[PDB]
Each structure stands twice: as C-alpha cells, then as structure tokens.
Amino acid sequence: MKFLTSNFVQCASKQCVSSGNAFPLTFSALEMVQQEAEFDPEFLVSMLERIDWAALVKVANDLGNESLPDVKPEIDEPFAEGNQGLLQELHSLLIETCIVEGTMKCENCGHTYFIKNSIPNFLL
C-alpha cells in the first residue's frame, strides 16, 4: 500500500460514490515502512498530471505530514538540478512509504475499512 495509491482509491458505497463523497478517504496508519524503489523523475512528473493534488495533501496531513507544496509543482525539466530536492522528496513519500497496518475512514457513510499486511480491503 504505497501512499500514492491513496490518491487512486475511494469508498465503495454506492451512495458516497453517487454523491461525490467517496473520494478521498481519510487515512490513519498504525504501522508504516520504507521500501527501496528505483528513482524516476520523469515518471514522477508525469504522475503529477494524474493526481488530485487537493486529495494528496489531505491524506499526507491525516498521516501527519505538512512537508508538501501547497499546490501542484509546475515542472518541465525532470532532470533539472533545481527540482531534484523536491522530486527526491516526492519519490520518498509517494513511492517509498508503505502502509502495512492502518484504516481508511469514509466521512460520509461512516464506515472504516482496513489495511492489513499490506492490502487495503474495500468490502462491506
């Protein structure tokens, strides 16, 4: 359960989905891990165009992180020296930090789903 995945996951309740309340789920983590992954600035910058940046910040907040740009970074040079600090730090968060145990609460239906080693489960 990479942090990134949080941005691609929502409550499965037909009502929260019907009423635009499914996304995003609010996250807590009883446990976490860092797992080494190859660094790809180009892929990171591409991802920025598939990410809901608002939701990305929230989930980082819920997991206790304010180290994250207010809005979507505008990068055109993935290999530029100037963006390497911010990109490395994005790789660190989005790709390398995994939740192993934690919950995912929907704030519209009330339900709380579980992440356990390290699979999120979205069943009633």
Partner 1 sequence: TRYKPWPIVEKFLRDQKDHSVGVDIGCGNGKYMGVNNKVFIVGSDRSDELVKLAHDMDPSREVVVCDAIDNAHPEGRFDFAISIAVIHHFSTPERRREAVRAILNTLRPDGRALIYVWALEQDQDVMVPWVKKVDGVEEVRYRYYHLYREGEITSDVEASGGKVLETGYEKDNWWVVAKRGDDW
Contact predicate 35/116, CB 8 Å: no
User: CA 105: distance to chain centroid?
Assistant: 14
The alpha carbon torsion through 100, 1, 62, 10 (nearest 10 deg) reads -130
CB of 79 to partner 1, least distance (A): 15
Alpha-carbon gap, residue 68 to 97, rounded angstroms: 14
State the binding partner of 47 from Zn ion, partner 1, none, CB within 5 to 8 A by kind: partner 1
Identity of the residue, 6 or 63, whose beta carbon is nearer to partner 1 in the bound complex: 6
Annotation-wise, does 109 bind a ligand?
yes
Interface residue with partner 1 among 28, 39, 47, 108 (CB under 8 A) is 47
Is 35 one of the binding residues for partner 1 (CB under 8 A)?
Answer: yes
Alpha-carbon gap, residue 22 to 117, rounded angstroms: 23
CA 60, 52, 94, 26 dihedral sign is positive
State the binding partner of 71 from partner 1, Zn ion, none, CB within 5 to 8 A by kind: none
State the binding partner of 86 from Zn ion, partner 1, none, CB within 5 to 8 A by kind: none
Which residues are at the interface with partner 1 (CB under 8 A)?
Answer: 1-2, 4-5, 8-12, 14, 17, 22-23, 35, 37, 42-43, 46-47, 50, 52, 118-123
